[PDB]
């Protein structure tokens, strides 16, 4: 309300020092100043890695309840974590993702040197936005928005299962309030 320069997202906080706006998805939202303590490139790579993992996590949390493979067994994903820990396949997932992150770490260390864009592994086999440059930043904005939405969504689904003990598809069709609150007294 009072005159002064502030961030586009939060109107009572100023624009952060290291959020100039060159990176996609930047609405000037850094209240605690994480970009002032650590580099924006490392933070962007961490954000993209978390967001992509969360995208695949939300897709899995939907599909595993929607359709389970003929092998393994029909079980909810959260205890399926323990089931596949005891089965041995999750250790192999860990090994292969570690093998990918071995090269990912070298990519990150070259990102600090400023030789590659943060989160840019140059993986476009379908050339969906490789030849065209105007589509590239639009797809980057879409990817980062989907990344944040997927992180929020996976956290929501997990914490809904933790108190509801129902599947995500089960909860949107058999919606029950927690703790027996429909007919609860002195809660």
């Amino acid at each position: 309300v009072f005159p002064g320069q502030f961030s586009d997202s939060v109107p009572f906080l100023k624009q952060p020092t290291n959020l100039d706006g060159s990176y996609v998805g930047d609405v000037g939202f850094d209240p605690l100043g994480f970009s002032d303590v650590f580099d924006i490139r490392v933070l962007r790579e961490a954000e993209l890695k978390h967001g992509r993992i969360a995208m695949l996590a939300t897709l899995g949390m939907v599909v595993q309840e929607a359709y389970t493979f003929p092998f393994f067994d029909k079980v909810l994903p959260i205890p399926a974590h323990d089931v596949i820990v005891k089965s041995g396949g999750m250790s192999q997932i860990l090994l292969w993702t570690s093998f990918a992150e071995i090269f990912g770490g070298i990519a990150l260390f070259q990102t600090i040197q400023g030789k590659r864009a943060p989160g840019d592994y140059s993986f476009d086999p379908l050339n969906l936005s490789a030849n065209d440059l105007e589509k590239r930043e639009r797809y980057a904005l879409a990817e980062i928005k989907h990344s944040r939405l997927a992180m929020l969504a996976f956290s929501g689904m997990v914490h809904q299962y933790f108190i509801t003990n129902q599947g995500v598809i089960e909860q949107i069709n058999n919606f029950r309030p927690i703790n027996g609150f429909p007919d609860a007294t002195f809660s």
């Binding site: 009072f2 320069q5 209240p31």
Partner: protein, 172 residues
Amino acid sequence: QAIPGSEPPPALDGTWVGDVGFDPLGFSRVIDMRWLREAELKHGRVCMLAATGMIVQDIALFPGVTKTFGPAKITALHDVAVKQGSMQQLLVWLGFLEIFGFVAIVQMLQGSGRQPGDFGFDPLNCGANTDTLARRQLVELKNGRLAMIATGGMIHHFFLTGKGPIEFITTL
């Protein structure tokens, strides 16, 4: 000019809303003025909402809330709602908002440019023009102080009598 015998602290020299020179103990001598005014507006707004909410609660309740919370109001309502999880949700989300409030206070104290109590929350462009904004600032401050005293009064009235605001004032 509030108290003719005494004098205001040198931090109280006008150019502030509600400055009638009333600070005999000298809080502005050791505390920054921006922090003091931000805290004054925060207490005032919290007590405004609390007093209006207490009046509404003692007048009319939500559907289905009496089935769970029973005939408990004010402090018994708090004691039941902490177990219910309503006040836990309030604490979580209001502390989440107070994170941004905290960094707003920090940027104000280090010189971003914002004024104490200014969170930019002005829907419908109400009172954003001319001297109406300053009049609304004075009204907000005075009504916040009045609501602060009234909130304390209602809390202590329920402490003494065990009755709500609208029923204590009608059953003296």
